[PDB]
From a paper:
Sirtuins generally catalyze the deacylation of modified lysine residues in protein substrates coupled with the breakdown of NAD+ into nicotinamide (NAM) and 2'-O-acyl-ADP-ribose. To address this, we developed an engineered hSIRT1 (mini-hSIRT1) that is biochemically equivalent to the full-length enzyme with respect to basal catalytic activity and activation by STACs. Mini-hSIRT1 comprises a catalytic domain that assumes a Rossmann-fold large lobe and a zinc-binding small lobe common to all sirtuins, an N-terminal three-helical bundle encompassing the SBD and a C-terminal β-hairpin CTR peptide18.
X-ray crystallographic analysis of mini-hSIRT1 resulted in the first detailed structural determination of a fully functional human SIRT1 with a bound small molecule activator. The N-terminal SBD forms an independently folded, three-helix bundle with 1 binding to the helix-turn-helix (H2-T-H3) motif within the SBD, consistent with the HDX-MS and enzyme kinetic results. STAC 1 interacts extensively with the hydrophobic side chains of Leu206, Thr209 (methyl), Pro211, Pro212, Leu215, Thr219 (methyl), Ile223 and Ile227 from the H2-T-H3 motif with only one hydrophilic interaction: a hydrogen bond with Asn226. The major mini-hSIRT1/1-binding site is a shallow hydrophobic surface depression with an off-center, deeper hydrophobic pocket, that the CF3 group of 1 occupies. This is consistent with the observed structure-activity relationships developed across multiple STAC chemotypes, indicating the requirement of overall flatness of the core scaffold maintained by an intramolecular hydrogen bond. In the crystal structure, Ile223 lies directly beneath the STAC and lines the pocket into which the meta-CF3 of 1 inserts. Asn226 appears to form a hydrogen bond between its carboxamide nitrogen and the carbonyl oxygen of 1 on the surface of the protein. Interestingly, a STAC-mediated dimer of mini-hSIRT1 related by crystallographic symmetry was observed in the crystal lattices. Comparison of the three structures shows that the locations of the N-terminal SBD domain relative to the catalytic core are divergent among the three structures, likely to be impacted by different crystal packings.
Numbering used by the authors:
A (entry chain A), B (entry chain A): 183 to 502, 640 to 658
The structure:
């Protein structure tokens, strides 16, 4: 669109600067800039998609808390950060759970292969030994899970969108949730798609027995009950999109906790809601590509404790401090790791 | 990489401007710019991939001709432009050849469907009626085809890469070629992959007979001989990549004719060769996103005639004029359509 606009102008010999004098007033582009380069800049300015800019009137951790109090339709996005204190065995790294699996199951190429649906059909047994070391109840939720849970009890949580699959969200008692990469909440047969509760296949998996489908014939191979993890290639749950279409025009506050927001669909949620709605980051590291009103950087448990401290009331009854303030709105706490 | 660099700096409260005073000397960013915005700019400058900038010493159509003379390892990229004079029925538009096909074959959803391999299996007959209206010999090559052909006779053509499938390249006698979206040059069975010449299935297709595979049993459905067009989904010919790996470090001149360079793999060829190697555009419209040393805009036949005029010698014996000069290097001829 803008591209054609510039093509038109090139056809007649327009001096880009007269266009740039309009698009960048109070800015004079250096003399030694190539004239085609100038045009490319023109296209860029016109092509740049509207990205939310930071609210100048929301800056301090005190402002954060007010929001937390006065808001009532809150969207919370959570990543690996929320579950760092939970002692969960890592599984993405070649050195992790894949280590203890490669010894009993030497047919595993990648730690990714156990999350591929194709290899799952060949051998589901390695995944299910993993599914045992992770299954809900085996791990205590973090202060953060507890924090989200209470705000949903208070009717304030509009939705918790998560990248996690540890399903500690349900363990911790959070009702209004959406697990984007799936979870252990339910299990569905690969074949007749018979859906069952989480508790249905608990015993089977705890006995290292591959859960079988009760509807399908017993003489059926792939009549296996698979926890509804989004395995490679598989589509994002339909519940996600339907939820966003509603939530985006309803939320009055977005909080990010523990995520470095670089993997879809969760990474695109900040950029997709009304720019006016306030936005708070809580995270080990800063996220330059986005404009957050308040940045609380450091260990996510730490910062959630510091906010429950300040929120008082029922929130303070969850707690078990020092920061560096970089203006206008950045706070560095203990666990700021930036790697 | 640059992203982490900026994360580090945010952790300690660096003023972006002291970084920008270094990255943009002789440029002072407006006062009212958000400090996170400034950082985003920092990331952009550091993240920007090296793109060839225009040679200041190559500008005029006379310079173009010198190149054409003194060069001997020339890469020529061609698009729809080269074949506009050739009277070929269009086939991409819903209103085109798909018009005369939808009446005899009402099972066609798209004009794209006849280029899908999946629908081709269901019914190949519509494609083959198209393949008849297009088949080599039925159309006379343009002045441009002839131009490329002669330069390859003279040993100057390193390679002609094309987006076209009209195969007028072989009709016109160009040996050193690469047809990126495939061509009618050869045909291969969907099953045993028996390869045959173009002339092998000429008779069959001219009689509206679906060419059959001589190796496969006669009682075989998909033993059909398919012209090696890249149909939807299919991979780019292996001949392409192997050719580029050689050609990129060998070419001394790149010429673009008739293409608006926006569809891969052909669109990425200018950006992928040594920046020092000169680059000439010949095209209905200008291509802002790229930096061409000389821009000859207008009908491609016109401009090729004007160059054969000037090249003299064997080139002038092909010919059957007015321009507007926009400095430093843009020429507008007759067919400049910019749509
Ligand atoms: O896009 C810009 N510059 C730019 C400058 C100002 C604003 C924007 C912009 C992009 N989206 C909204 O605004 C973009 N580019 C750019 N800008 C410059 C540039 C350098 C110094 C000063 C200036 C400026 F903007 F004129 F002051 C631009 C140089 C090369 C480039 N490259 C060619 C096009 C790209 C990459
Ligand atoms: O990328 C730029 N600007 C920019 C400016 C100068 C050079 C480059 C650039 C990009 N690649 C090589 O150089 C890019 N952006 C940009 N630039 C500006 C801008 C406006 C006026 C002046 C200037 C400048 F560059 F400081 F003079 C930048 C404003 C907003 C933005 N947006 C936030 C980041 C994007 C989009
Ligand atoms: Zn079943
Ligand atoms: Zn065959």
């Amino acid at each position: 669109g803008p591209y054609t606009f510039v093509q038109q102008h090139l056809m007649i010999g327009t001096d880009p600067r007269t266009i740039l004098k309009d698009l960048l007033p109070e800015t004079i582009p250096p003399p030694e800039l190539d004239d085609m380069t100038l045009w490319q800049i023109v296209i860029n300015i016109l092509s740049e998609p509207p990205k939310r800019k930071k609210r100048k009137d929301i800056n301090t951790i005190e402002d954060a808390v007010k929001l937390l109090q006065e808001c009532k339709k809150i969207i919370v996005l959570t990543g690996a950060g929320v579950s760092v204190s939970c002692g969960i065995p890592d599984f993405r790294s070649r050195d992790g759970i894949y280590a203890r699996l490669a010894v009993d199951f030497p047919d595993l190429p990648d730690p990714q292969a156990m999350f591929d649906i194709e290899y799952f059909r060949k051998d589901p047994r390695p995944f299910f030994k993993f599914a045992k070391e992770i299954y809900p109840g085996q791990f205590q939720p973090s202060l953060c899970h507890k924090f989200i849970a209470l705000s949903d009890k208070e009717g304030k949580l509009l939705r918790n969108y998560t990248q996690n699959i540890d399903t500690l969200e349900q363990v911790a008692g959070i009702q209004r949730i959406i697990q984007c990469h799936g979870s252990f909440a339910t299990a569905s047969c690969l074949i007749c798609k018979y859906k069952v509760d989480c508790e249905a296949v608990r015993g089977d998996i705890f006995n290292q027995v591959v859960p079988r489908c009760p509807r399908c014939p017993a003489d059926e191979p792939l009549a296996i009950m698979k926890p509804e993890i989004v395995f490679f290639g598989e589509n994002l749950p339909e519940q996600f999109h339907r939820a966003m279409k509603y939530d985006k025009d309803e939320v009055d506050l977005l909080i990010v906790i523990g995520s470095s927001l670089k993997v879809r669909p969760v990474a695109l949620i900040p950029s997709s809601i009304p720019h006016e709605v306030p936005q708070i980051l809580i995270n080990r590291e800063p996220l330059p590509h986005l404009h957050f009103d308040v940045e609380l950087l450091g260990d996510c448990d730490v910062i959630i404790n510091e906010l429950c401290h300040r929120l008082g009331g029922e929130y303070a009854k969850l707690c078990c401090s020092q920061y560096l303030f970089l203006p206008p709105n950045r706070y560095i706490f203990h666990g700021a790791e930036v790697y």
